[PDB]
């Protein structure tokens, strides 16, 4: 027999799958260079002709 269901507002069963989109930053082509090095290990050099 077919059960009848009317509009609700907030159920526990919907909150079991409310999760659907995840904005993570895991290994990918756009997340390869996660770590940048500060000026403690960089040399600032000028661009000369023949460089």
């Amino acid at each position: 027999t077919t059960q009848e269901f009317l509009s609700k507002n907030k159920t526990i069963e919907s909150e079991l799958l409310d999760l659907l989109i995840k904005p993570n930053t895991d290994d990918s082509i756009l997340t390869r260079n996660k770590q940048a090095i500060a000026d403690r290990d960089l040399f600032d050099i000028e661009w000369e002709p023949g460089q």
């Binding site: 500060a38 000026d39 403690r40 960089l42 040399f43 600032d44 050099i45 000028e46």
Partner: protein, 113 residues
């Protein structure tokens, strides 16, 4: 970062991103603090000897150079002492910031405070 001399510029504390003027501010802070000025660290600071005859006036220069080298590792320090006319002992601290390779000019110096 906040460079040493606390100046309220544009209504906020002067924050500089570059490490070169921050290192210069570190040098100024080290030279402007006399050993004993700070209550937390009573040993940090340059040693000051003012009223004494000018016979052993190079040892204090060497001590200041050593203190600058130990305290600030991002720069190289060479300190020279000259004897002036009346009572002035002229110290010249030549410093270079190891991160950069050329002389780094700062635009805040040109601004009139």
């Amino acid at each position: 970062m906040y460079v040493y001399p606390p100046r309220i510029i544009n209504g906020t504390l002067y924050k500089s991103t570059d490490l070169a003027e921050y290192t210069r501010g570190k040098i100024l802070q080290t030279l402007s603090i006399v050993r004993g000025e700070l209550v937390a660290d009573p040993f940090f600071g340059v040693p000051l000897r003012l009223f004494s005859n000018i016979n052993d006036y190079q040892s204090d220069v060497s001590k200041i150079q050593i203190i600058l080298e130990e305290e600030i590792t991002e720069a190289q320090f060479i300190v020279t002492g000259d004897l002036k006319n009346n009572g002035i002992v002229s110290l010249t601290v030549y410093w270079a910031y190891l991160g950069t390779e050329n002389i780094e000019n700062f635009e805040i110096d040109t601004s009139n405070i």
